[PDB]
Q: What sequence folds into this?
């Protein structure tokens, strides 16, 4: 909802930013996010 | 017939998406026909009026 | 206090629209930060995942 999904080279940081994420996206801390479960969790077509 | 045969190219010309073009295809989703002439007329010699 | 001073940076870590991002600023209007690292990741050996 305001997010693009391109096959970017994603820099691999080491932060613990998984903690309280699936509950934080449900309440709406993030203004715009895309949840990709299953086949959508892919480095998309160029 | 004023002539029997003509010349002309034997092969198709190649437009391959090279490095500047691959990055902007991956990241922006947009390719230019020549990144090299765009470089040569923006960043390498901008005041050279073509 | 255990210490009276901390060791921090002395200048702003600058960022200018250089030769590779000027083409996409003038052409597309999409600058990325560290275009050279995108080129290092997907052009020069994309088979080496970070």
A:
């Amino acid at each position: 909802e305001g997010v693009e999904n391109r096959p970017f080279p994603y820099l691999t940081v080491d932060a613990d930013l998984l903690s309280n994420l699936r509950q934080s996206a449900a309440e709406g801390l993030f203004h715009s996010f895309d949840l990709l479960v299953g086949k959508d969790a892919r480095e998309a077509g160029i | 017939e004023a002539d029997n045969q003509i010349m002309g190219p034997s092969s198709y010309a190649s437009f391959v998406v090279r490095g500047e073009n691959l990055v902007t295809a991956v990241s922006y989703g947009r390719v230019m026909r020549t990144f090299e002439h765009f470089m040569a007329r923006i960043v390498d010699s901008p005041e050279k009026a073509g």
Summary: The two ends of chain A are 20 Å apart (CA to CA). Chain A touches chain B at residues 6-9, 46 (CB under 8 Å). DSSP finds one helix and no strands in chain A. The first helix of chain A runs from residue 24 to 27.
